[PDB]
């Protein structure tokens, strides 16, 4: 499943749980549109922070 | 002929058939919700009957 999540308001947390462990034990693909993120591009030699 | 209905005569009677719950029906599992509200209080549609 490629589930579109358009917005994450109003779920309930175990369903949330629930679609995490669908990513992981049935492969889903889900995509969360709702979210904003800035990111920083770690060289390998100082990891992840 | 059918069985008259105790009610529809006037003789009292001594023995009856009582249904009965065979144990408690108050077990203690009171149903329990998960209330999530809106998340923002501006974007709530009133809206639409």
């Known amino acids: 499943v490629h589930m579109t999540i358009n917005e994450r308001a109003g779920?309930?947390?175990?369903?949330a749980d629930?679609?995490?462990?669908?990513?992981?034990?049935?492969?889903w693909v889900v995509d969360?549109?709702?979210?904003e993120y800035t990111?920083?591009?770690?060289?390998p030699s100082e990891g992840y922070t | 002929q059918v069985g008259?209905?105790?009610?529809?005569?006037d003789h009292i009677s001594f023995?009856?058939?009582?249904s009965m719950m065979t144990a408690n029906i108050?077990?203690?599992?009171?149903?329990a919700v998960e209330r999530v509200n809106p998340d923002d209080v501006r974007a709530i549609n009133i809206r639409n009957a």
């Open chain 1, 39 to 43: 990111a920083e591009v770690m060289t």
């Open chain 2, 4 to 9: 008259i209905p105790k009610l529809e005569v």
């Open chain 1, 11 to 15: 779920m309930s947390k175990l369903v």
């Open chain 2, 15 to 18: 023995s009856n058939v009582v």
């Open chain 2, 26 to 31: 108050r077990t203690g599992d009171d149903m």
């Open chain 1, 32 to 35: 969360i549109l709702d979210i």
């Open chain 1, 18 to 27: 629930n679609i995490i462990a669908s990513v992981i034990k049935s492969n």
